Amino acid sequence: SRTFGYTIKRTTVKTPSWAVDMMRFNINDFLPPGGGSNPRSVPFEYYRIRKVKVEFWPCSPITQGDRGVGSSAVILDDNFVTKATALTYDPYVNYSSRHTITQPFSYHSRYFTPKPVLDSTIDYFQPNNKRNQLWLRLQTAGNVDHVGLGTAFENSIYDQEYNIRVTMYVQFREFNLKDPP
Amino acid sequence: SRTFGYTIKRTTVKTPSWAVDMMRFNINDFLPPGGGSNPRSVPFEYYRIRKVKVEFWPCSPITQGDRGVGSSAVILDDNFVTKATALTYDPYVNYSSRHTITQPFSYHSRYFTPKPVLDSTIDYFQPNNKRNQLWLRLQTAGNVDHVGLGTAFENSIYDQEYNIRVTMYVQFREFNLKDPP
Amino acid sequence: SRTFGYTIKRTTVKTPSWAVDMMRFNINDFLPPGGGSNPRSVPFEYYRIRKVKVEFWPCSPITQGDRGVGSSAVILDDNFVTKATALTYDPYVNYSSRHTITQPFSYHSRYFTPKPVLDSTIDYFQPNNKRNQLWLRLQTAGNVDHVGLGTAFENSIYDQEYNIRVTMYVQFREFNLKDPP
Amino acid sequence: SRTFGYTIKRTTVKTPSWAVDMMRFNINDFLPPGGGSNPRSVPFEYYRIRKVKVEFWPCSPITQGDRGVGSSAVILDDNFVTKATALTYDPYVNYSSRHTITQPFSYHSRYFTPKPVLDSTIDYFQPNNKRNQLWLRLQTAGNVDHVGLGTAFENSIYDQEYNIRVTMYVQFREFNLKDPP
Amino acid sequence: SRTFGYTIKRTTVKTPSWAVDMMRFNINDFLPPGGGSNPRSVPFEYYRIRKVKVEFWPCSPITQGDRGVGSSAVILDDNFVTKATALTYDPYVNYSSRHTITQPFSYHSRYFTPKPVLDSTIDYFQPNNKRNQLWLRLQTAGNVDHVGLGTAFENSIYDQEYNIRVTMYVQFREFNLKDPP
Amino acid sequence: SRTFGYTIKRTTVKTPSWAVDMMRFNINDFLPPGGGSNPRSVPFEYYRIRKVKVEFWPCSPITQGDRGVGSSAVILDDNFVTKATALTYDPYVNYSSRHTITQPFSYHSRYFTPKPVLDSTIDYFQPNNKRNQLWLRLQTAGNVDHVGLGTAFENSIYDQEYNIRVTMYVQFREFNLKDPP
C-alpha cells in the first residue's frame, strides 16, 4: 500500500538489452510505529495473507515510443539473477506462468500469493492458495521479508519512470488490544 | 474492558439506607493515545455498538453477612437521582425491566445496549436492538459519554468493595490506515 | 502431568493491580532419564500432540474473599508481556477466545493445542486442530519448549497459592525398542 | 525379538538319529533394565500376548546336502523328552497339528500362542486364541517362563548352524508412567 | 540414480553380531555441474519428491552360505545409532513398518518417501504421502541432505559386497530456461 | 524465445513499395552449450513441436503516421521470393490463410506449426496439426532449420524498428540424464 520511484537509466547500446530489478516485500513498511502500550498501530495476535494484487502503473505518455516486450516471471523461492545495467538476454522469457510485459503506457498487472522466508540459506516456502498456509506473528522489528514479483523492463534511448503499487491484503484474527489507565 | 475501585462507605444508622452511585461509559478510556500518523490505536472511520455484557463482580467472602436486596433499574435517558450517602428509600425498586441485586458474594450481571447523548440539555437516544442504530465516528478528544447501568447497593455496618467490569463490544467497519515513510 | 507451586505475592497498593506470569511447556519434564540401550522411558520414533486439558486447580478456601476477575487469553505465537509484580492494567482483557478467570475457590480450566517453536527469533507455529500437524521426534536433551496458556491473576491483600495441573496428551506411533543381551 | 547361536554337533553314527532341543521363552530378555523411577523400559500395568510368529531362519547354503525331515510338534503343557545327542527315534512324529521340518536351506516357520506356567509341579495353561486369556503383570525379576516350540533337527555328518528368531507380540494396556522432578 | 561399493568387513567373533551403516541422500550427486547461464543441468524453479524405490541389489552367489536375518527399519527423523563394527544386538528389530532382511542372494527392497532436514539440531520433517508436502528449490551448492533407509546387515566369516541402488523420483514444475546469445 | 533488431531502411521513392524479409527458425539458438557429460542444457531423447505463437511486437509510437497494410502469408515449403529493398508489388497478397498486417503501433500476431526440412533440394514437410508428426532428435551442432512466417512490411519515409518475438513450444519426452562422479 505504498509507492516508490524506480527510474530505469537509459543506455546508448544499440542492441535491445534488458535491465532486471528487485522488489522485496516488507510488512513493517505498511505500518508506522505506535505508542504507549501498543507499539503496533494494528494489534493482532495472528494474521495471514491471501493474495497481493500487484500492478506496475506506468507514467510515460503514449507519444513516447521505444516500446518493447518482456516476461514477468513469478519468483518466490529466492533466486534472483545478478543485476546488470544492460543484460544481453531475458532469463525470465522461458516460464510456465509467464505474462507479456506491455510497455510503456500499456497497463500491466499480476496476481499471486507470497510466503515468508524461514532461513536465508535454505529458503523455504508454502504452496500457493492452500488451507495449509503457515500462520505468522506480529512484530515491528524482527520481521522477515517476503519475495515479490520478478520484473524485467527493456532498456531504451529515452528515460523511463514507473510508479509501482501493491495492495498487500491481510486477514487479521484474534485481536489483542490494551487499554491501560 | 477495565476495572476501578468503588468502595461503599459504611454507616452507623440502624435503618437499612441505600447509597446510589453513578457509572458513566467512555470509549476514550478503552484505548490509549497513538503516535505518528495514527493518533488512535484502532484506526477506523465508522463503528457501532451492539450490547455491553456488564457485570458487578463482588469481592467480599461468603462469611460476611449483612446481605440485602435491591433493583438495578436500567438508565439511558440521562436522569440520575441526587446522590446520597444514606438514602432512606429505593427509587429503582419500581421498574419494568428490573433485576434483583443479590449481594454480596452472590454474582449479579445485566445486559443492555447504550446509545450516545447528542445534547446535554435535551438528551436524545435511539431505540434498543434495532437496525436504525445511528452510527458514530472515531475521536480521541471530542468524544461523548454513554450512559451506564443504574446501581443501588444497600448500606451495612461492614465495609464493601466490588470489582465492576464491562465488556463494551464494538463492530468496526471501513478501516482507514496510514503507512507513511 | 506434573504440578508446581506458584504463589502470588500480595501487595499493599489499593488499586486492583494484576500480576502476569509465565508457563512454558516442556516434554522432557514429563519423563525421567532411562538406562542401558534406552535413554528414554517411552521409546518411539514419532509422536504428535492433539490437545492439553489444562486446569488451574485453586487451593484457597471459600471463606477467603478478595475475589476478582481476569481473562486467560491463549498464547502460542510467543509474545509475552513484560512481567510486573503489580500491573496497572489487564492486557489480556481484549481477546476473541477469552475466558473469565473466576477466583479463588471457583474452578477454571481451558483447552487448546500447542505447537513447537522452530526458531526463537522468527517463532513459527502450525494451525490449530488440523491434519497438517507437523510431526516431531523424541529427544531427551535437544528438545524445544512449547508455549502454554497466558495467565493473569489479580493481586490482593491476602496470599494466594494455586496448584496448576496439565495433562499433555500424546499419540505415539512407530515404536523403536531395543532388547540387547 | 532376539537371536542366539544353537549349533547342532555332528555325529559319526550311520543311522539317522535325531537331536531334540529346548527353547524356553522369557519376557525379561526382550527388555533391558531401566533407571530412576522406571526400572522397566516399557511401563504398563497390564499386558497380553496374542501370537508369536516363530521362525527358524537357516544359515547353511544350498550346496550342503544331508537333508532330512522331522516334525515340529507344539509343546505348552511342559513335558519335554530327555535330551539326547543322538536319539534313535522321533517322538514328535505322531501329532495332530504337526509340521514337516524342511532342512537345511528350506525355510520353515510356525504360529502358536504361548501361556504362562502357574506352578512348576502341576503346570497350568489357558486355551488357545480365546477371549478368556488370563492377564498378567509387569515384572523385571520375578517373571515366569513361557513354553516355546518343540524342535527336532536330524543329525548329519556336516555341521549345522541356524538363526532362530521369534517376534513375541504384546498388547499393552493401561499405561503407568512416572515423571518425577 | 547411482551406485557405490559398500563392503562389510568380516569378523572372527563367533556370536552373530550386526554391523549398522548409514546412507544419506543427496540431490547434488544426481546431477553434474552445468555451464554458461545454466549452472544446473536440469533448470527448474520448483520440484517435489514422491517416493524412492530403494533396493539393495546383492552381488554374492547362492553357493555362499552364512545366511542370517535382520530388520531394515525406516529412518527419517534423524537419529542413527552409534556405528559399531560388530554390534551385539539389533536395535531395528522392534518396529511397526519393519521388513525382513533376506541375505545374501535373496533380493530385498523397500519403498518410502524422504523429506528435507530443516535444522540439524531440531530436525523437522513433513508427513508421508500427503498433499501438504513442503516444496523446495534448486541449488547446486547450498543443498540439504535427505535421510535414507536404516540398513543392518549381519556379520559373517566370509566377505560381503552389495550394490545399493536408488531411483529418486522428481516432479519438476515451472521451468526456468536461459538462452543467451 | 529470443529477440533481435530488424530495422527496415526507409526509401525516397514515392510509390509505396514493399520490402520482403526472412525469418528462419533454429532450435540451437533457444539453448546454450552445456558442460561435462551433458553438452545440452535440456537433456531429452525425443521432442516434438505443436505450435509457435509468433508475434511482431512493434516499437514505434502512435503519433508516427505512414501507416500501410500487407499480408503475412504463411510459408513452410521453402520458396521465398528474391529479396528487394523496394518491391513494386506484394506477392503475399493473394493467399487463402492470409492476415492483414496492421502497422505500426497496431498489434499483429499469427499462429501456425513448423516442420523440419529433410533435404535442401526437395524440401519435404509434414501436415499441420496431426498425430503423424515425425519425431526428431536432440543435437547441438548438426541441427536443421525450420521455416518461419512470411513477413512483408511496407516501406515509408520515416524509419521503422520492430521487436520480433517467438515462443517455440516444445513437448519433450523420454529424458536421458547423466550423473557421473
Numbering used by the authors:
A (entry chain D), B (entry chain C), C (entry chain K), D (entry chain L), E (entry chain M), F (entry chain N): 50 to 230
The authors write:
Currently, PCV2 is the dominant pathogen causing PMWS and a number of associated diseases in pigs, severely affecting swine production worldwide. Notably, PCV2 capsid protein (233/234 amino acids) encoded by the open reading frame 2 (ORF2) of PCV2 is capable of self-assembly into VLP and resembling the icosahedral morphology of the native PCV2 virions. The PCV2 capsid protein is the only protein responsible for PCV2 capsid formation and the dominant immunogenic host response. In literature, the crystal structure of in vitro assembled PCV2 VLP derived from N-terminally truncated PCV2 capsid protein was determined at 2.3 Å resolution, whereas the cryo-EM structures of in vitro assembled full-length PCV2 VLP was determined at 9.6 Å resolution. These structures show that PCV2 VLPs are assembled from 60 copies of PCV2 capsid proteins with the icosahedral symmetry and several exposed loops located on the viral surface, which may serve as the immunodominant epitopes eliciting neutralization antibodies.
Roughly 9,600 particles were used for 3D reconstruction, which reveals a typical PCV2 viral capsid structure at 4.12Å resolution with an icosahedral T = 1 symmetry comprising 60 capsid protein subunits. The local resolution distribution was assessed by Resmap/Chimera, showing significant resolution variation ranging from 5~6.0Å on the outer surface and inner concave regions to 3.5~4.0Å at β-strand barrel regions. The relatively low resolutions on the outer surface and inner concave regions of the VLP capsid suggest the structural flexibility of PCV2 capsid at these regions. In our cryo-EM structure, the density of each capsid subunit is clearly visible even at r.m.s.d = 4.1 Å, showing a typical circovirus capsid protein fold consisting of eight β-strands joined by several loops located on the surface of the particle. By contrast, some surface loops, such as BC-loop (58KRTTVKTPS66) and CD-loop (79FLPPGGGSNPRSVPEE94), are relatively difficult to trace and build due to the weak densities, suggesting the structural flexibility of these exposed surface loops. The N-terminal fragments, such as fragments 15PRSHLGQILRRRP27 and 33RHRYRWRRKN42 surrounding the N-terminal NLS region, are clearly visible on our cryo-EM density map contoured at level of 3.6 e/Å3 (r.m.s.d = 3.60 Å.), suggesting the relative structural rigidity of these N-terminal fragments. In our cryo-EM structure, Arginine-rich residues (15PRSHLGQILRRRP27) next to NLS-A reach into the adjacent capsid protein located within PCV2 VLP chamber, and interact with its NLS-B fragment (33RHRYRWRRKNG43) to stabilize the VLP formation. There is no density map available for N-terminal fragment 1MTYPRRRYRRRRHR14 due to structural flexibility at this region, strongly suggesting that this N-terminal fragment may not be essential for icosahedral capsid formation and stability.
